[PDB]
Amino acid sequence: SGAKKLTNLCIKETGVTEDLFIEAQETGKMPNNQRLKCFIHCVLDKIGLIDADNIVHLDNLLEILPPEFVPIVEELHTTCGTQSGADGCETAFLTTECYIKTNPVILKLLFTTFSE
């Protein structure tokens, strides 16, 4: 139950609440709440996708994932890269906003996954 274990830890660590996830899903617009930004950073950090300098390395998934995920990961990495904000949580949020614009199908499924 890896993804649920990860989600649990990051919920407890950031204080994100279910109302924020419901609002993102029901409105299609992630709310600009710092606890949601930091949850997203927490998830990226747990998977190893953002480093201590707040640079995103989504291309890491390419050595890891089955070939069927390569085109999707490559497109998100090349289109979005690192969308830098003032700190790690802002960078995670801005980069994920770019991911949602680039591949809404995949990001909507991931949001249901990494949700309480």
Side-chain angles (χ1 to χ4, degrees):
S1 52
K4 295 278 84 204
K5 290 187 297 194
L6 198 157
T7 296
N8 165 68
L9 285 182
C10 286
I11 289 170
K12 289 183 160 58
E13 182 180 327
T14 63
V16 73
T17 44
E18 183 59 20
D19 62 294
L20 299 177
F21 292 132
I22 291 166
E23 171 89 359
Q25 294 183 124
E26 288 190 340
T27 69
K29 177 176 192 300
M30 302 194 290
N32 272 82
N33 291 92
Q34 299 304 116
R35 290 164 294 126
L36 180 59
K37 304 189 183 168
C38 290
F39 173 82
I40 298 175
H41 177 270
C42 184
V43 171
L44 292 177
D45 176 79
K46 264 28 169 196
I47 303 173
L49 305 176
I50 192 172
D51 66 22
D53 292 87
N54 301 328
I55 285 108
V56 178
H57 307 288
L58 195 75
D59 55 324
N60 283 358
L61 294 181
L62 293 166
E63 309 173 71
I64 294 170
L65 287 172
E68 54 251 45
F69 291 87
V70 163
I72 284 155
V73 170
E74 294 193 347
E75 175 188 49
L76 293 168
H77 171 73
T78 64
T79 304
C80 295
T82 303
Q83 296 293 308
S84 292
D87 55 48
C89 301
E90 307 295 341
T91 300
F93 188 81
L94 294 168
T95 302
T96 296
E97 281 185 311
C98 180
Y99 294 162
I100 285 164
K101 287 183 184 57
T102 300
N103 199 325
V105 167
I106 295 299
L107 271 284
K108 286 173 170 187
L109 294 165
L110 286 166
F111 257 78
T112 320
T113 296
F114 295 109
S115 166
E116 191 176 357

